[PDB]
Design a protein around this ligand. Structure first.
Ligand SMILES: [Cl-]
Ligand SMILES: [Cl-]
Lengths: 144, 144
C-alpha cells in the first residue's frame, strides 16, 4: 500500500493524542484539546447541532465523561486521507455518573464507535462522532 | 494532497456504486451487492452482532428499507486509505413502513451517517454502519 504522506502521518499523530493524553478520562486532557484544536473548533455529536468553539466543545466533552469517568478507549482502526482522519475504537466502562438525563446506574457498556476529524494546517477544526447511543441508553435505563 | 493510488481509487469506485445502483431504495440493488461483496461478507449495524453471509446481509438490508422505502442518500465525504473506505452521507425520507418494531408512522427523518467498508482484492468483505439511530427511533416513536 501507498504510504502516508508527511502531512497525513502528522495529522494522525496529532489526532491520536486525543485518545491518550487528550482522552477525557485522563487528567490534563483539556490542555491537550487547547493545543490541538483551533479556537473555532466545532464538535458534532451524532445528529445534534454543532457545539461551536473550543471551550464550549470542551465543556460538552466534560459532561459526557461525568457519566463514564473511568471510560476506556481502545483504538482499532485509523484511516487517513489528507486532512480527514477517521478513528474507530471500542469503549468500555461503567455509568457511574449522570449521563444524558439518566441517573448513575453503574451499568457496563462495551460499544464500538467512530470519530471523524477534519484538520487544517495541522490543527483539528471539526470532530464528528457516532457510537451505538441507542444501545447505551437502553442498557443504562434498564430497570433493576 | 497525495493522489489516490490505483487500488484506492478502484476501491472507491466500487464502494460508491452501493450508494447509487446498489442503494436499497433502487430496483436491482441486490444484484449489485452480489457482484460487489464476497460470499462471506459481514454486515455490522451499530453494536449489533455481525450478520454473516451475503444473502443474510442482503436480507437484513431489505428489512431496513421496508421501513423507509423511498430513503434518499446524499454522499458528502469519501475517505480512503488502502482497503478501507469511509463514506459519510445524509439520509432523508419518511418511515412509511414498519421499522425495528415501530409500526409505520410516516415520520420524516434527516440524519447524518457513516459507513465503513473493508475490501480485499477489489471486493467488499465487511461493512460497519452508524447513524443517529436514537434520534430516528425517538422521532418515529413520538406520539401523534
Ligand atoms: Cl483537564
Ligand atoms: Cl433488487
Amino acid at each position: 500500500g501507498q504510504d502516508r504522506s508527511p502531512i497525513e502521518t502528522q495529522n494522525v499523530e496529532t489526532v491520536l493524542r486525543l485518545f491518550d493524553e487528550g482522552w477525557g478520562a485522563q487528567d490534563g486532557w483539556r490542555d491537550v484539546w487547547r493545543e490541538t484544536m483551533t479556537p473555532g473548533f466545532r464538535s458534532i455529536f451524532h445528529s445534534n447541532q454543532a457545539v461551536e468553539g473550543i471551550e464550549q466543545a470542551i465543556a460538552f466533552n466534560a459532561v459526557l465523561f461525568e457519566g463514564f469517568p473511568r471510560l476506556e478507549v481502545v483504538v482499532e482502526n485509523v484511516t487517513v486521507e489528507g486532512d480527514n482522519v477517521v478513528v474507530q475504537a471500542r469503549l468500555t466502562g461503567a455509568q457511574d455518573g449522570p449521563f444524558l438525563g439518566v441517573p448513575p446506574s453503574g451499568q457496563m457498556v462495551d460499544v464500538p464507535d467512530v470519530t471523524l476529524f477534519t484538520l487544517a494546517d495541522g490543527q483539528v477544526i471539526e470532530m464528528r462522532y457516532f457510537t451505538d447511543l441507542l444501545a447505551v441508553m437502553t442498557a443504562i435505563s434498564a430497570p433493576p
